Amino acid sequence: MEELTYRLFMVATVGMLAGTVFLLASSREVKPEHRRGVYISALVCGIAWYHYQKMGASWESGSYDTGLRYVDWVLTVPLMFVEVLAVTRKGAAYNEAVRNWGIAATVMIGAGYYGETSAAGSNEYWTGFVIAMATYVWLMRNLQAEGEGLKGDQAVAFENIKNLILVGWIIYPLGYIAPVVGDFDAIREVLYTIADIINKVGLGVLVLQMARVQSGEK
Numbered sequence: 001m002e003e004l005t006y007r008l009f010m011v012a013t014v015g016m017l018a019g020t021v022f023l024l025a026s027s028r029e030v031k032p033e034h035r036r037g038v039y040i041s042a043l044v045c046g047i048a049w050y051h052y053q054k055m056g057a058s059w060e061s062g063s064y065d066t067g068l069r070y071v072d073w074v075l076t077v078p079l080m081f082v083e084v085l086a087v088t089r090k091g092a093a094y095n096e097a098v099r100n101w102g103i104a105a106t107v108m109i110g111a112g113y114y115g116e117t118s119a120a121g122s123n124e125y126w127t128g129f130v131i132a133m134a135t136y137v138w139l140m141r142n143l144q145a146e147g148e149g150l151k152g153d154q155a156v157a158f159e160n161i162k163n164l165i166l167v168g169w170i171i172y173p174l175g176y177i178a179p180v181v182g183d184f185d186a187i188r189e190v191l192y193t194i195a196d197i198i199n200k201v202g203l204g205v206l207v208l209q210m211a212r213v214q215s216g217e218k
């Protein structure tokens with residue numbers, strides 16, 4: 001498991017860079033008024049690229065620092081909400097949702113960090129999990145409520161964005177509890193890495209697809 005985990009870190013590192021530069025290269029494919037979300041998606045992948053280089057070296061050393069993962073999450077998760085909420089809101093409604101979801105994400109990630117750095121299976125470990133879970137469900141329920149009146153191609157493209165988050169973010173709580181299901185400390189890191197690739201690169205691709213639709217492309 002240890003060698004597999006290192007290799008996945010190294011592959012994911014190049015994957016995040018590839019997501020970054022692909023998304024930048026693809027920005028010319030959409031109208032200029034819809035390129036902001038593609039650029040923000042590239043920034044998300046670029047921040048992850050930076051932290052993934054650190055995580056792979058950290059894992060390779062044998063003294064791994066999950067703080068690298070959690071600081072990447074605390075920066076990138078609110079950024080991912082910036083473009084999701086732009087589809088459905090502007091002005092005051094947008095500013096309120098971006099702030100409130102970003103606060104919730106920070107609580108979720110901070111609670112997860114508190115629990116993950118505690119003894120596995122301890123009351124502190126479960127406290128972090130439960131607080132993070134409740135905040136996560138609150139975020140998902142808010143996300144499900146967004147864009148209810150949308151129709152047509154834009155509604156389909158937004159539902160694809162929503163479903164990627166609603167399904168793909170489930171991997172994180174699974175990874176967090178992997179160490180208590182078995183001798184699976186490394187499996188937590190495997191699942192987190194797979195999830196980050198799927199969720200970061202995947203959301204960027206779907207945001208690009210959202211921009212094509214908004215550009216009037218078929």
Ligand SMILES: *C/C=C(C)/C=C/C=C(C)/C=C/C1=C(C)CCCC1(C)C
Nearest residue numbers: 076109112132133136169172173176
């Ligand atoms: C780019 C990175 C992303 C989108 C990371 C998202 C991570 C979360 C949704 C993790 C949430 C957690 C729980 C729901 C419970 C256990 C603790 C966490 C922080 C792993």
Ligand SMILES: CCCCCCCC/C=C\CCCCCCCC(=O)O
Nearest residue numbers: 020039040042043046047048049050
């Ligand atoms: C804790 C410090 C985090 C360090 C983050 C470093 C990330 C830099 C990676 C590449 C970013 C490039 C993404 C492009 C930015 C938007 C494109 C644009 O503005 O035209």
Ligand SMILES: CCCCCCCC/C=C\CCCCCCCC(=O)O
Nearest residue numbers: 067070071074107109110111113114
């Ligand atoms: C128990 C609920 C906790 C609520 C958290 C409130 C704000 C916490 C913000 C997020 C911190 C996550 C990043 C910390 C990792 C870096 C630590 C390190 O590098 O050593």
